Amino acid sequence: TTVPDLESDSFHVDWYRTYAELRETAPVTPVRFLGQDAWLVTGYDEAKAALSDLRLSSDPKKKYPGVEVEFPAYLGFPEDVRNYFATNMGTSDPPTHTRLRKLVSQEFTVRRVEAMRPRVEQITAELLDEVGDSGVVDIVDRFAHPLPIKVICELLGVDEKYRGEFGRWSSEILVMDPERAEQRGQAAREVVNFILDLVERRRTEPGDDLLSALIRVQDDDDGRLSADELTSIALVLLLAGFEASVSLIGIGTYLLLTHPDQLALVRRDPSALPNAVEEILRYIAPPETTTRFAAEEVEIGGVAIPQYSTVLVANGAANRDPKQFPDPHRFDVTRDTRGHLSFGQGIHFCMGRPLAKLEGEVALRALFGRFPALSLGIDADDVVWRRSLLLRGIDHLPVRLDG
Numbered sequence: 429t430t431v432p433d434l435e436s437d438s439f440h441v442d443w444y445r446t447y448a449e450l451r452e453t454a455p456v457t458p459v460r461f462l463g464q465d466a467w468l469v470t471g472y473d474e475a476k477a478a479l480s481d482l483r484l485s486s487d488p489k490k491k492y493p494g495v496e497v498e499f500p501a502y503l504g505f506p507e508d509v510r511n512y513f514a515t516n517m518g519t520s521d522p523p524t525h526t527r528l529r530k531l532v533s534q535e536f537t538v539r540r541v542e543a544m545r546p547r548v549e550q551i552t553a554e555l556l557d558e559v560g561d562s563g564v565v566d567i568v569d570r571f572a573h574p575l576p577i578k579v580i581c582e583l584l585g586v587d588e589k590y591r592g593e594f595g596r597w598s599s600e601i602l603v604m605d606p607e608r609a610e611q612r613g614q615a616a617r618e619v620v621n622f623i624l625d626l627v628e629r630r631r632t633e634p635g636d637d638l639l640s641a642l643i644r645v646q647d648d649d650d651g652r653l654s655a656d657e658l659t660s661i662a663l664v665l666l667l668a669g670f671e672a673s674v675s676l677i678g679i680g681t682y683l684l685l686t687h688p689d690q691l692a693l694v695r696r697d698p699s700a701l702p703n704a705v706e707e708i709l710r711y712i713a714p715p716e717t718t719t720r721f722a723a724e725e726v727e728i729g730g731v732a733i734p735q736y737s738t739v740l741v742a743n744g745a746a747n748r749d750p751k752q753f754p755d756p757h758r759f760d761v762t763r764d765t766r767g768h769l770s771f772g773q774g775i776h777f778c779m780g781r782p783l784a785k786l787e788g789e790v791a792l793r794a795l796f797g798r799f800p801a802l803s804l805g806i807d808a809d810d811v812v813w814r815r816s817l818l819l820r821g822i823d824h825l826p827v828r829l830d831g
């Protein structure tokens with residue numbers, strides 16, 4: 429009768445109740461978004477199956493007869509910039525995906541991540557010393573946002589260039605508004621230009637950073653990264669290396685602030701902080717939806733998805749599927765969070781999980797341990813949520829440091 433429109437307010441206002449209504453009617457249903465027809469998967473079993481079914485491609489660069497592949501996430505991106513945004517593991521199918529991921533894994537290791545633990549502790553300490561001891565402060569602008577950025581910039585050796593402006597480009601990209609399509613494509617071109625200069629700069633002056641190491645990495649069978657592969661990987665690692673963590677920290681702070689019972693338990697038992705981060709991810713997944721393209725007709729949950737269809741897997745909705753997580757709408761730092769889809773599932777499983785968990789744990793521990801009277805600076809129902817199916821988050825969050 430009525431095909432949902434992902435641009436309506438139903439998907440940005442108490443939107444989880446809207447997901448629950450669709451899932452109950454059909455975990456796989458037709459929808460409209462950005463002017464195109466698509467399928468939305470809101471069931472946990474359906475979502476898991478989808479992400480595991482390789483007939484559902486992750487590569488937007490592939491050409492098929494008489495069809496125009498259009499991933500929403502690239503709204504307003506010129507052809508060349510899109511290619512720069514999509515020649516990396518997250519936008520590649522095996523066997524290309526397999527080799528790109530292996531070459532990067534050789535340098536982006538748990539070892540390199542763990543070695544940054546002290547640095548992350550220090551950056552976190554410094555940002556907190558600067559907020560003061562009292563009054564109202566935007567915890568996002570003064571903490572949640574800068575922390576992940578400083579960490580990713582040091583990992584990739586980013587210093588010069590618009591080190592404070594790319595944050596501005598990244599923001600416009602997180603929103604997909606048909607109106608601001610041109611401004612979105614222009615910001616994307618700016619990030620590309622920025623990466624090209626960075627890579628060229630690093631080739632000229634090597635260091636011990638992750639970028640320098642990827643430029644030299646090579647395997648006997650797999651070989652090495654091409655100039656374009658190298659550029660695109662740097663680009664995504666830079667953007668995805670911090671945006672999602674900013675969401676994790678902001679949303680995590682908000683959640684603990686509105687659930688004293690859960691916060692008390694964390695302050696009491698510190699060894700329980702790791703699972704709290706996991707529940708924060710399950711409750712409100714930053715990457716609410718992930719995109720796939722049907723290279724062949726595929727059946728999901730008894731529903732035949734026609735070949736050449738765009739498929740939107742609602743990771744966020746799946747994490748709220750009652751059949752998988754009982755009392756889904758309840759934030760519980762003590763619940764079993766195994767199987768959530770916030771880090772993905774299958775061959776594209778999120779490579780930054782170790783870094784993300786590190787940043788989340790260190791940040792929330794330092795924040796609440798430094799301010800025992802920390803409280804929200806505004807009414808809970810007045811917090812403004814980012815309008816993005818791509819990456820959910822809180823852009824502004826007033827907190828009272830001394831209660």
Ligand code: HEM
Nearest residue numbers: 517518668669672676715718770771772776778779780784
């Ligand atoms: C709270 C933080 C994070 C969340 C929730 C998150 C979530 C995800 C998800 C859902 C996927 C799979 C997407 C798909 O299947 O298409 C993914 C993939 C990936 N993530 Fe993360 N991520 C986070 C942080 C990071 C960080 C810190 C980095 C990098 C420093 C990173 C790098 C990647 C990469 C490279 C992939 C592509 C993996 C592949 O295609 O093989 N992520 N992430």
Ligand SMILES: CC[C@H]1OC(=O)[C@H](C)[C@@H](O)[C@H](C)[C@@H](O)[C@@H](C)C[C@@H](C)C(=O)[C@H](C)[C@@H](O)[C@H]1C
Nearest residue numbers: 501517518519601664667668671672715818819
């Ligand atoms: C503009 C489109 C791109 O988005 C972004 O880079 C966003 C800023 C990130 O927050 C995304 C959402 C990530 O956090 C991860 C979930 C997925 C990421 C690692 C990919 O590989 C994926 C192909 C991605 O690059 C694109 C969707």
